[PDB]
Amino acid sequence: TERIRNVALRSKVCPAETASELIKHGDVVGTSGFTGAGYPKEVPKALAQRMEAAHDRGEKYQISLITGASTGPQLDGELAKANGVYFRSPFNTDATMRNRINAGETEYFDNHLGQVAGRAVQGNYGKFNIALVEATAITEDGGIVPTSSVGNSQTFLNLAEKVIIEVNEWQNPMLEGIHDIWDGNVSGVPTRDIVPIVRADQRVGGPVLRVNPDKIAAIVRTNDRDRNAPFAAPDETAKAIAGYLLDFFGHEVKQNRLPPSLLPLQSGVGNVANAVLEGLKEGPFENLVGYSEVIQDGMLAMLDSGRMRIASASSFSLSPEAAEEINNRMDFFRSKIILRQQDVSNSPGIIRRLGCIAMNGMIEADIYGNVNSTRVMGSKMMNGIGGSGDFARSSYLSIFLSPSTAKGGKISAIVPMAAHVDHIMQDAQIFVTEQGLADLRGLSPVQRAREIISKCAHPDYRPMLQDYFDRALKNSFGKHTPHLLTEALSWHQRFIDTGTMLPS
Amino acid sequence: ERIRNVALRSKVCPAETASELIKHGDVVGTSGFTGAGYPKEVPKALAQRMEAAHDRGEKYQISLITGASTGPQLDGELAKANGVYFRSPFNTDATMRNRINAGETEYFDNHLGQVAGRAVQGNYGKFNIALVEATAITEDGGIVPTSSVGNSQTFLNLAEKVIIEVNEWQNPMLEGIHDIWDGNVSGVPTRDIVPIVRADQRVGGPVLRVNPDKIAAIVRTNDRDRNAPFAAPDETAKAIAGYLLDFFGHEVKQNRLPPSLLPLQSGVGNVANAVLEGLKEGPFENLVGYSEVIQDGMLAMLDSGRMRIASASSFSLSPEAAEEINNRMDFFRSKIILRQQDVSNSPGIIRRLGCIAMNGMIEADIYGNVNSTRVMGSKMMNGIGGSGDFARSSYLSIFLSPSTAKGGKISAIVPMAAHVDHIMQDAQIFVTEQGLADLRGLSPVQRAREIISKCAHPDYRPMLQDYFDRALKNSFGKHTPHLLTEALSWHQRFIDTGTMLPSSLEHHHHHH
Ligand SMILES: CCCNC(=O)CCNC(=O)[C@H](O)C(C)(C)COP(=O)(O)OP(=O)(O)OC[C@H]1O[C@@H](n2cnc3c(N)ncnc32)[C@H](O)[C@@H]1OP(=O)(O)O
Numbered sequence A: 001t002e003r004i005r006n007v008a009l010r011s012k013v014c015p016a017e018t019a020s021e022l023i024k025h026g027d028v029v030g031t032s033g034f035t036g037a038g039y040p041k042e043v044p045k046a047l048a049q050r051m052e053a054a055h056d057r058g059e060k061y062q063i064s065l066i067t068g069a070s071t072g073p074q075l076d077g078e079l080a081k082a083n084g085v086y087f088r089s090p091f092n093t094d095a096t097m098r099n100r101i102n103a104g105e106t107e108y109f110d111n112h113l114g115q116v117a118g119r120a121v122q123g124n125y126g127k128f129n130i131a132l133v134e135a136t137a138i139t140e141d142g143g144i145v146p147t148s149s150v151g152n153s154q155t156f157l158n159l160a161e162k163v164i165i166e167v168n169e170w171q172n173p174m175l176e177g178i179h180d181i182w183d184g185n186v187s188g189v190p191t192r193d194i195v196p197i198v199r200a201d202q203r204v205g206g207p208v209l210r211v212n213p214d215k216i217a218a219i220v221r222t223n224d225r226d227r228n229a230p231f232a233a234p235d236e237t238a239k240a241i242a243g244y245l246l247d248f249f250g251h252e253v254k255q256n257r258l259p260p261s262l263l264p265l266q267s268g269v270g271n272v273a274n275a276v277l278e279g280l281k282e283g284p285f286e287n288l289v290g291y292s293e294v295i296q297d298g299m300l301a302m303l304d305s306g307r308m309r310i311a312s313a314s315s316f317s318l319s320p321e322a323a324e325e326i327n328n329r330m331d332f333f334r335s336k337i338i339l340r341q342q343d344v345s346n347s348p349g350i351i352r353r354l355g356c357i358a359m360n361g362m363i364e365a366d367i368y369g370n371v372n373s374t375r376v377m378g379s380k381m382m383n384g385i386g387g388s389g390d391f392a393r394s395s396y397l398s399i400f401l402s403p404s405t406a407k408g409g410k411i412s413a414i415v416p417m418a419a420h421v422d423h424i425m426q427d428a429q430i431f432v433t434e435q436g437l438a439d440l441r442g443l444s445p446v447q448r449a450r451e452i453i454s455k456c457a458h459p460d461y462r463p464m465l466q467d468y469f470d471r472a473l474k475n476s477f478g479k480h481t482p483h484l485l486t487e488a489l490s491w492h493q494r495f496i497d498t499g500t501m502l503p504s
Numbered sequence B: 001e002r003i004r005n006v007a008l009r010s011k012v013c014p015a016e017t018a019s020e021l022i023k024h025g026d027v028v029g030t031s032g033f034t035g036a037g038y039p040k041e042v043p044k045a046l047a048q049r050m051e052a053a054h055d056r057g058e059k060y061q062i063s064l065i066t067g068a069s070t071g072p073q074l075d076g077e078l079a080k081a082n083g084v085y086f087r088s089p090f091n092t093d094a095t096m097r098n099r100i101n102a103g104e105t106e107y108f109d110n111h112l113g114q115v116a117g118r119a120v121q122g123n124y125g126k127f128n129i130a131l132v133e134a135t136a137i138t139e140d141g142g143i144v145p146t147s148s149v150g151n152s153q154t155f156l157n158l159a160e161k162v163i164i165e166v167n168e169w170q171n172p173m174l175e176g177i178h179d180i181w182d183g184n185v186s187g188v189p190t191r192d193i194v195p196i197v198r199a200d201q202r203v204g205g206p207v208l209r210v211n212p213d214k215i216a217a218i219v220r221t222n223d224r225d226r227n228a229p230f231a232a233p234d235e236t237a238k239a240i241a242g243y244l245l246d247f248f249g250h251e252v253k254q255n256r257l258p259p260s261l262l263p264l265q266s267g268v269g270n271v272a273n274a275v276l277e278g279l280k281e282g283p284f285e286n287l288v289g290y291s292e293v294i295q296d297g298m299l300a301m302l303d304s305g306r307m308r309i310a311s312a313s314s315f316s317l318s319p320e321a322a323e324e325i326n327n328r329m330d331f332f333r334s335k336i337i338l339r340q341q342d343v344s345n346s347p348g349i350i351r352r353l354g355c356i357a358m359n360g361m362i363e364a365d366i367y368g369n370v371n372s373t374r375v376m377g378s379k380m381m382n383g384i385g386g387s388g389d390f391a392r393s394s395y396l397s398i399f400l401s402p403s404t405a406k407g408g409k410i411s412a413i414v415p416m417a418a419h420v421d422h423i424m425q426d427a428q429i430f431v432t433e434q435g436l437a438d439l440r441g442l443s444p445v446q447r448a449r450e451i452i453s454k455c456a457h458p459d460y461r462p463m464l465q466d467y468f469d470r471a472l473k474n475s476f477g478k479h480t481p482h483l484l485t486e487a488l489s490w491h492q493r494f495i496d497t498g499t500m501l502p503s504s505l506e507h508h509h510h511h512h
């Protein structure tokens, strides 16, 4: 069945190589793509090869690459290998691009995901020369049907001078209808519109991205796979974390501080957040609803078991095997899923209005419950802040989840001082590790420290943390948030110097 | 007569007697925001009784939850009496600050727009007492607030017992200036759409609502608000304002702002005063305020017509300005709206209106993470206040500061901030008396080049550049380069020696 149902537009079909020639050195390129889903594939590859050739002849050839969130090997991977990206935003998980960023070869800024469209419209990234968007289909009236994510695609189509569409036959035609694309002003010039979403399952828009056909400079027929890593099957550590959190939710419900169906759930990036969902799929909370950034394997499992009724997100982040299950059963799942623009899924006003429960992973927290989501030793990027700030600050309850140690016990995930802060104390109420759960509500920073050290820290590190805190209480400049600045970052330096935070 | 409900007159009683309603261990929610509209006589009486108990070996402390900062009669008196075991969300009293920094009062500085919601969630415990200052009580038992709204409606809803102070010092014509909504802003989810699409829009009514059966005492008072002295702009503040106004002018000439700018949020003090004086004289028109506070300079622009409306939760005026507004309250009442702080500080509304946020800071690191609160990482100044509410939600987030503190002995730009309140993602523009750093579109290393070159003081720039250069060469990763062995060392140098500037009797890499 012809994917390009608008006859006139079929005359714009051309090779990926010729299409990549539309992209010039210095160009700002906005693309589809969010958590390994729905990014363009063939045009980036052809661009990457031409970049390598140009570099060899001594011609500069780099672009600024602005996305929804993370992409995949065919985009971030290929372009990073070609050394073809001078600036990248807002979120990356590709290892080659991460290495470019941590070597200082690609400039990176990890914006709050819900803010990226608004900053793009403001002009922070410069003028958009190109929008490169992957599509399932092009309707008879010229609407662009997105694929496995929505992300920022509508904004990039609005802003870009020229548009390139990759129509990917690999993507399931039955995705058509799953998306909700709103006509209103969420991220445009102030004053913005009221966004009328008052329930997580409410559709307010239409199934297609809109674009003036005169801006479409090329359409490329493609055939290639989305690719994501699988999730870790929940091990004893993740299962322990899920157990503590489910017990916690149970107590909240019994104290009537949550409804029996809880509140709309946001589940973050990563293996731990995913294991919580596996716990919920057989849990005592029925008729759950998701209002999230992404739908991971665990959430799809909850939809399968019936524990969750509907899930809202901007994207799928499915393992290879989960992605294949939803495609065989898109009829069952299409009615249970709404894919929204990321400036709507990650809207702080909507998140607060709905009363979302935020569950997110973390690199580390300090004893006062400030959280690092991003920068190992303070300087080495992992992935990026993503939507964790959008949700942590706006949520009804902000929960952070992590193994109490990393790197086989050589790093403590609870430290005297975080080497970088993404989420301040005010934005984190509940911490869970395999050691236990710290409920920080109502507590001052020294009271937070008592709870975090005693409930969450690993036994190998808890005495060292207690020693730091007790001596800080005695000798610190002020006693509101006691620190010893001579040793606050010393565990991190010890890791850099010796490969472990444990003293000899 | 200020109490126009006859039945409620029977609940009038002396401050001392009313204070006896407040028991050891009680959670007390009070009016009060930026030194305005807090209760005065009952806290004074309570403090006396607290001290008397303590002298006899009897415990007597409360948990004190407010709108924001109060004044000497409340935070001051109770701190002197050592009568507060927990305080939230925001304090500026010196005595209370000392209790907090000694560990004698537990403190948590919540985002101001979130406090009502967390109170309803139960995070502070069950409220035993609401103690609220009023201008008047209407015929149907409505409570007219005074010079701030703050969290008073939420505290009235939650408290077991209510005490009202009716203050004849407060102008009767304040009645009508407030907008109090009965909609669900901070209650149980799902909350209501807050339908504000203009800074001058009213959604509620003029009074706080409370079941009269919960009113245990009404106290007649006559006492002044804090009314801190006017902070006359010095040359540093005037330079900062000059760079900022030049930036606004350029944004307008590039069509990235309207000639009327966008709704403005500013703080209080030296620099904010200079900015407001600059706006009064600048090439802009039809300005609008959507802020936490009304300050002296705003009255000036509302009078001239330069500003069309100002929205806030409170007044923060000098004695001169307080006198000007009371002599002309009928005029200014038509130009000002005072809202609940969970509405003035609503992130959804701030974003929707596209506010420009202008906030102070203790320090920023070279990558443009910002400390608003904790000197050396451990000593509380005031609190985060509404700065997070506004910085994260704003159309443009601007931080303004002298480039040095303590007579040059501290750099306000440091290798690493000792505490973070506002992450890089929440700060786009920095202004000091040295210049303006526009960070839009930049990675952290690019932010550092701009902050060091534009904002740092000449006495500290070579040291900052030296840290940055060596971190670029040696850091674990190069995305946000640091040297962890010395990242906090300027702070420790200050703790140990009283200055961040080194001595030439030892090696320092920038010296060579
Ligand atoms: C609403 C949007 C949500 N988005 C976000 O939260 C984005 C930011 N968050 C994230 O990137 C992830 O949640 C985190 C923080 C990386 C945690 O991921 P996760 O729950 O899968 O954690 P997990 O324990 O499996 O570790 C993931 C990686 O981080 C590493 N890591 C985790 N904690 C660490 C620590 N304290 N020190 C060093 N490395 C650490 C860990 O070693 C692993 O890397 P490698 O595979 O060894 O190269």
Ligand SMILES: CCCNC(=O)CCNC(=O)[C@H](O)C(C)(C)COP(=O)(O)OP(=O)(O)OC[C@H]1O[C@@H](n2cnc3c(N)ncnc32)[C@H](O)[C@@H]1OP(=O)(O)O
Pocket: B265, B266, B267, B268, B269, B270, B271, B292, B359, B360, B361, B362, B363, B371, B372, B373, B375, B381, B382, B383, B384, B385, B386, B387, B390, B402, B405, B406, B410, B411, B412
């Ligand atoms: C929309 C809500 C706005 N609310 C907020 O921003 C609340 C948090 N902000 C604040 O408390 C204030 O903006 C700040 C951060 C204290 C800055 O205050 P300000 O702009 O009036 O600046 P100013 O230079 O007068 O300094 C205030 C105090 O902090 C001190 N200070 C400022 N920077 C400092 C630094 N880098 N190191 C040490 N002390 C510093 C300064 O010495 C003064 O202390 P004293 O009263 O003399 O003991």
